[PDB]
Amino acid sequence: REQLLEVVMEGRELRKVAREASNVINANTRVGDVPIASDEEFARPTGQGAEIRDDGETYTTVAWNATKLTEGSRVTDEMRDQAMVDLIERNIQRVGASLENGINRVFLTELVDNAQNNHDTAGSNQGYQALNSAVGEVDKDDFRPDTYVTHPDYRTQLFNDTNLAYANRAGTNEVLRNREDAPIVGDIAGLDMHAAMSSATYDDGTDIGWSGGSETWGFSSDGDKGAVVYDRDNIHTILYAPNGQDVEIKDYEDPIRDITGVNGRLHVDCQYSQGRSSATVQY
Amino acid sequence: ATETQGEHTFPVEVLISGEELRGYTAGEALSAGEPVYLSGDYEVSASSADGGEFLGVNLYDVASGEPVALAGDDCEVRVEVSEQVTANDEILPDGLGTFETVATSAASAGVAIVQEGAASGEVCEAYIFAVQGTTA
Amino acid sequence: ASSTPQTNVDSMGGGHSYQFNGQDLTFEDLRDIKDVRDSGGQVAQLMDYKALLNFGEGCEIHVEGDDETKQLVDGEPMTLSEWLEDAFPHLDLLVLDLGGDALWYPYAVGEIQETITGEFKEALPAEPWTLMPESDAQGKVQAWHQRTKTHGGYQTQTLPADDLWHIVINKASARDEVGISEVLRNKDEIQAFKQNEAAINQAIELHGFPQRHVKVGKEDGAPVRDNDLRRVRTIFDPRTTDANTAYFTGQDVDVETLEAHNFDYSAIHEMDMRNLTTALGLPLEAGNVGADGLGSGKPAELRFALLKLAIKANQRSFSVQFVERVMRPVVRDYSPFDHEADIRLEINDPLEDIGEVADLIQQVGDYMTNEQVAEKLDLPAPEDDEVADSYRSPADMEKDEAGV
Amino acid sequence: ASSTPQTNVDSMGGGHSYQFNGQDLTFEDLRDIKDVRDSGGQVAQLMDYKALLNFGEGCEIHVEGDDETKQLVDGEPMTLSEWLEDAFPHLDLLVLDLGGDALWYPYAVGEIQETITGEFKEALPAEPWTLMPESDAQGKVQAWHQRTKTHGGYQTQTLPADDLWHIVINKASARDEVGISEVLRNKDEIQAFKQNEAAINQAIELHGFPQRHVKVGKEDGAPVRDNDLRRVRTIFDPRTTDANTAYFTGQDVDVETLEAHNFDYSAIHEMDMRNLTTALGLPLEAGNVGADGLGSGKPAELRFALLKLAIKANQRSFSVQFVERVMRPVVRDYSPFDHEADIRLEINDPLEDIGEVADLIQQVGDYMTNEQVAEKLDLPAPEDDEVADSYRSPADMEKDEAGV
Amino acid sequence: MQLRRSPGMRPMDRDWHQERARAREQAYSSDLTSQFSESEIVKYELDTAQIDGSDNPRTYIWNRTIDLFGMNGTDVRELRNR
Ligand SMILES: [K+]
Ligand SMILES: [Mg+2]
Ligand SMILES: [Mg+2]
Ligand SMILES: [Mg+2]
Ligand SMILES: [Mg+2]
Ligand SMILES: [Mg+2]
Ligand SMILES: [Mg+2]
Ligand SMILES: [Mg+2]
Ligand SMILES: [Mg+2]
Ligand SMILES: [Mg+2]
């Protein structure tokens, strides 16, 4: 009586945060514009009885062009019958996961590359003082950040900081106990959200079909960008789908060839409303 | 041809895209991703080193006399190259189960065009666009 | 305890896509159910027999303390039961329609419709293959997504859960507010049946009848070409032949026969119908197929008990949801009565025997009120309360009153 | 004696979900049960028939001496039965769901739920494949661990044993709080059935029908190549042949037949169904399969008695746990009545013939009170206590009172 | 696209497990070429299975030419001291 071991062991799963960590727009069109107002100015010293000169509101836009992201799979119908598990369910899960990873790559690459401020730690004081300094850099441009996005090496280094690691310095032992799941990690330097990213997420340009970003994402070597401190309301992830609100997964049979497949799609763009509202932290 | 992921080696999925698959008989033992040519009536064997021997790439490992699935032309495939290649390079069966460039071969025209470059001994992605046979 | 469910419910986010489902069923699966129902033949007829058994015998509305509800509706007095029977005049048909849909599809679904004056008009069913629910982290439906064929373009829209209503007969679990299609649950069995039926039909054509094989020429002799056979074909042509045609030949022509090759297609049909009827929960007899031994005695009593139990379970499940989600809102919003009253909708037993009930009434009527007898016998109760509530027959009370 | 157990149990040192098979009950095992349940076909229908037999006939609530409990609940009287009947309006459906789950899974499990104002709403079941108990060193459940599919991953949580409830029909021993799933217990028999079904279906496709074998060429004569057979294939093509096609040939073409190779698949079906039904404890007849001699007389009387005993055993096991672990807490925590009252929940016998009960009432009614008759006959007892408590029929008391 | 025989898919196929289990139970040596088809070795990747004959029951079963004691057919790994 040959009873098989039915279980399949999972691969590496990346962290997905872009839907929470940015303003999501569910667009009505695959291309579109967000109107931006000009900065506030100072009123003008004027002589009594003189004409008041104009300096009215002026406007521009940031455009979105939601790039179609896709992931497909095809299997011989004969194999669907012989599979140890629901092989179509597994491919649906993979296809959906590849799209969520796609969103997070578009988001993180916009976030890191187009941040207008930077704090260079010069290999020193890299924990709390770097977050506070990066908030200071955004504050000098008169925006207020509320979120930070973080690389695994930055997280690792930050939780060695005695200001977080000693219970009396943190006012709480949660960082020592529960690490990134501690409430203080999401409530630090005036920031009320932490978005833990995966290392593979940023577009290095080494992955197929992708052309890389301008920076290095990491926190291991001279010049790596390891965290971004930013205003969550000033970075937009724009999602477009023709057949609904979100990811569309379609099953199909080949009409001729006894092949079944599953295909996922979503259109996504990411754009800063105000790139000055964001600062990278650099190794 | 292989991805490495920690301890693990995973075989690459050979066929990227394409609907034109056809079934043949193996004239010899063959392995997934090998270029093959016609060697008897509906019988395919591994391609030799220059032009005139290519119908498609074998999609799965076979013993002699087993049925073979080919990706023919119109398919995009993940294939190992024996030399460093770049986008737009035409490539040709190498005689070694790999491909190589037309430029390196004695031939003058290829069977597939590289879309994604690779180092020597590494997986490129290429579009198969032509077959080659005995012209004399 | 608590006022919100504290166990989770295995359902949030639709899997890998939400407002359109990833793993869970789709508009294309819904149209697959529609195509099975539409297509006719044996499978369609069996699932229509299932609908007729569960819902075809009609219904009765009951209210506990109905007399206490007496109120003037338009100067005329009504009870809540009288008002509901006026609100839902054709309920027997509606129950069969919705009851059919909720066996085929995961749910029956519909609207409440008003007159222009804003009085209640009807509970209007919607085409169930056009609609799918969106549900929350505790598994409750919050919106309905519709698409319809509309001059080729799919008109597509979203409606709140607030003003639609829906009913689920078949559930994955007690918390499943979306339900299971019996068709999609048995998709493979339905296909296996259809494939085997097609295979039998083709086998009857090829093998059910003898075929004439004329062999021409002597063995080891002169060969015969196609044009030579064409002239012989003209002589022995079955189109031209008749029942008593005789043949004259030389020794070098043979009229052989491919005999009809025996195979028990009747046994294959029995086996197919057994597999399908069991998969759809019906007895084999519903498929116009009999079985040895099973047609008699306690073996019969068991299978018809199993069928009646299945029907009672579906009927209770439907009746509760129809009262709670269709009738109570209508009483609340368009009626002067208290909607918190104990309304019930009974659905009749399709296999009840009036003769068995009459025997029962003869044997034990002495222990039954005339209202109980009238209800068992499917009659209006007596017009006089003391006659309805008493245990002597009304005809016996009449002859007593005549004696007095 | 003592106030705590002093005999040990086979528990794995506590912490684990230790079960009958000397190991740990995983969420994989739980979802394997869900897969047998949801996947349809014959095994699913049989375990559904098992649930319907045990719990489909509905329920009745009794409290001993309940007329003594009369109390104002909301400025108006109730007895404890009347309060419980309002607390659990749809108990027939709940009993069927939980009783089904407790036959499929090792346990049925759920919550108590409250209104926003904090009075009792309902006992709310939870999805049993999602929840796993943790036993201590004396086997008692201390916590419930839950994991559930959510938006492409899983949520997970722990809940205390203190505010869920659970019911176990099948036990390893009278001390087992984890229970045993009949689906896991009979996993090999279920797989053996499914494999033999697949084997028969495949064997019917290959061997159930005749197949035409055309042989071409003279034996020891000229060879025929594939390209030559390709033209002969066109002539005897089964796709385009019809019932009365005739053939004309030379002597060197033979039209042979692979006969339908007779095998008794009907007997293999019977043997599979016999193995499965007996393993699931159903009678053979539930499988749409019959057998000689067993259909009548004392052979029938016995197997129907065995079925009814198996049903009564499950029903009592369920009823006790539901009263002790759901109803008594609900009375204690949300009711003005005494929870120590002698409550019984009884589940109806699915295989009663009311005709046999009516024969009994005819024969021996002279020895039963009108209340006892009404209870056997499944009717409300008479409204007036003296007639309810008397022995002669209410119709006889009426005709004699009318004689005054 | 992935066929049932394709190298990345073999571990999903029930037959790949069933047939590798058969091969281990049937084997009388690690020398696969002595015993298995070129088809079997390729299709079931039998080089990667730990085949050696140690899983074959007949490695452990007695089969003496004369047996006065009914010892033949006993499997030594079912004895008390195993
Ligand atoms: K060369
Ligand atoms: Mg624009
Ligand atoms: Mg001026
Ligand atoms: Mg200005
Ligand atoms: Mg700046
Ligand atoms: Mg912890
Ligand atoms: Mg804060
Ligand atoms: Mg193409
Ligand atoms: Mg001659
Ligand atoms: Mg010759």
From TrEMBL, chain A:
Mg(2+) 6 binds at D120, D222. It comes from the Viruses. Mg(2+) 2 binds at E41, D55. Mg(2+) 4 binds at E51. Mg(2+) 7 binds at N178, D187, D192. Mg(2+) 3 binds at F42, D55, E71. Keywords: Metal-binding. Mg(2+) 1 binds at E2, D33. The keyword DNA-binding does not apply. Mg(2+) 5 binds at N117, D141. This is HK97 gp5-like major capsid protein. It comes from Haloferax tailed virus 1.
UniProtKB/TrEMBL annotation, chain B:
Keywords: Metal-binding. Mg(2+) 3 binds at D73, D74. It comes from the Viruses. Mg(2+) 1 binds at E3. Mg(2+) 2 binds at E19, E20. This is Capsid stabilization protein. It comes from Haloferax tailed virus 1.
Automatic annotation (TrEMBL), chains C, D:
It comes from the Viruses. Residues 380-404 are annotated as: Disordered. This is Portal protein. The chain holds residues 31 to 434 of 675 of the full protein.
